Amino acid sequence: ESVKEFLAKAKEEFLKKWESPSQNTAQLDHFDRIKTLGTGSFGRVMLVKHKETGNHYAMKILDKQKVVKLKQIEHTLNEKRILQAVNFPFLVKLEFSFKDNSNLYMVMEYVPGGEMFSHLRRIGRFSEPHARFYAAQIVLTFEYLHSLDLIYRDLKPENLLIDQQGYIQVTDFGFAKRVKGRTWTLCGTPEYLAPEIILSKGYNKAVDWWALGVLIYEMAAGYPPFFADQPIQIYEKIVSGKVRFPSHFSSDLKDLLRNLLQVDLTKRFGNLKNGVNDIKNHKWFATTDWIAIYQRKVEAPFIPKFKGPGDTSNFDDYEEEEIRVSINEKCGKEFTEF
Numbered sequence: 001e002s003v004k005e006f007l008a009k010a011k012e013e014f015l016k017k018w019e020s021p022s023q024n025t026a027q028l029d030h031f032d033r034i035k036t037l038g039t040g041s042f043g044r045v046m047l048v049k050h051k052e053t054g055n056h057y058a059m060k061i062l063d064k065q066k067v068v069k070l071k072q073i074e075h076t077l078n079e080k081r082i083l084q085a086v087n088f089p090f091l092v093k094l095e096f097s098f099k100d101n102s103n104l105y106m107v108m109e110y111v112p113g114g115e116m117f118s119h120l121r122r123i124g125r126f127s128e129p130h131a132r133f134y135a136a137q138i139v140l141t142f143e144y145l146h147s148l149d150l151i152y153r154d155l156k157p158e159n160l161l162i163d164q165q166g167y168i169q170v171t172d173f174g175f176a177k178r179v180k181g182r183t184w185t186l187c188g189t190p191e192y193l194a195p196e197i198i199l200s201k202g203y204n205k206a207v208d209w210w211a212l213g214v215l216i217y218e219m220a221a222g223y224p225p226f227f228a229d230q231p232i233q234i235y236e237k238i239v240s241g242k243v244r245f246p247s248h249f250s251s252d253l254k255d256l257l258r259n260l261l262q263v264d265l266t267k268r269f270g271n272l273k274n275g276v277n278d279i280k281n282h283k284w285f286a287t288t289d290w291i292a293i294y295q296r297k298v299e300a301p302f303i304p305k306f307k308g309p310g311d312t313s314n315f316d317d318y319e320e321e322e323i324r325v326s327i328n329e330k331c332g333k334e335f336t337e338f
């Protein structure tokens with residue numbers, strides 16, 4: 001009952017913000033630009049500093065014209081509407097959002113420890129206890145999101161930041177969506193796609209549990225289970241129902257992964273009658289104190305090295321390009337709700 005009541009309150013609070021989203025809560029000239037932290041085909045993420053408070057933030061900047069071109073309008077509206085409505089210890093906090101003639105802006109807490117991807121590639125692989133510490137946080141986060149009828153759809157190490165306590169902050173809600181029943185959009189990242197996405201089915205939250213299997217495998221092995229030079233070859237492996245496990249994997253790890261990387265979505269852990277509890281009660285998680293993880297009382301396997309809240313050392317170097325704002329409004333109608 002404690003979990004039922006927690007999730008009922010969580011959904012109540014989400015729905016209130018979902019139905020009445022915040023809008024236009026800052027503007028660009030309230031911030032100083034510090035550094036480009038990452039780039040994409042329709043936007044970038046910048047470290048900025050608020051000029052009055054001195055607080056640092058990560059600012060995601062999306063070019064409205066490129067969003068339309070890349071057919072991401074609904075996705076960008078989902079992303080902001082969801083992020084402004086959620087509240088969970090392992091989800092990045094959106095502090096402000098606004099738009100101007102050219103761009104959409106989402107201003108989030110800055111996490112100087114950087115992406116799990118960098119740390120994983122530096123160390124090679126994580127031990128099972130280390131992978132399990134992160135996996136537990138994802139399990140709780142998906143239990144939260146799924147209860148709110150949200151599917152995340154982009155789990156991968158690049159979207160998981162490691163904070164000053166060594167805990168995960170899930171960022172990048174660009175593919176997240178509120179879904180009752182099924183959804184159909186082809187999206188995600190190739191190595192992490194469930195078979196039913198590849199096969200163009202109407203799919204559900206089970207795709208997030210598949211992706212958790214991929215992430216746990218990658219954390220514990222150092223590489224993902226389905227790898228190839230071309231996406232088409234990745235997709236053939238994903239749909240095949242065959243995965244090879246390193247000999248160093250524990251038997252409990254292999255068993256959990258066979259049930260998450262289950263090609264038949266109707267047999268996949270997280271999507272059965274017992275829902276998330278088939279995962280939480282699995283032997284691989286026997287040492288996990290779920291409440292202690294939620295309360296952030298477990299000492300983390302490691303804390304990233306950083307010098308302070310403005311340190312960018314754990315992010316990489318990108319060409320610094322202008323943030324141009326047109327004299328004329330672009331795509332006003334498409335982004336009215338933002």
Ligand SMILES: O=[N+]([O-])c1ccc(O)cc1
Pocket residue numbers: 038045058060114115158159161171172173
């Ligand atoms: O906002 N975002 O989508 C982000 C932010 C930071 C990061 O490292 C990756 C993605």
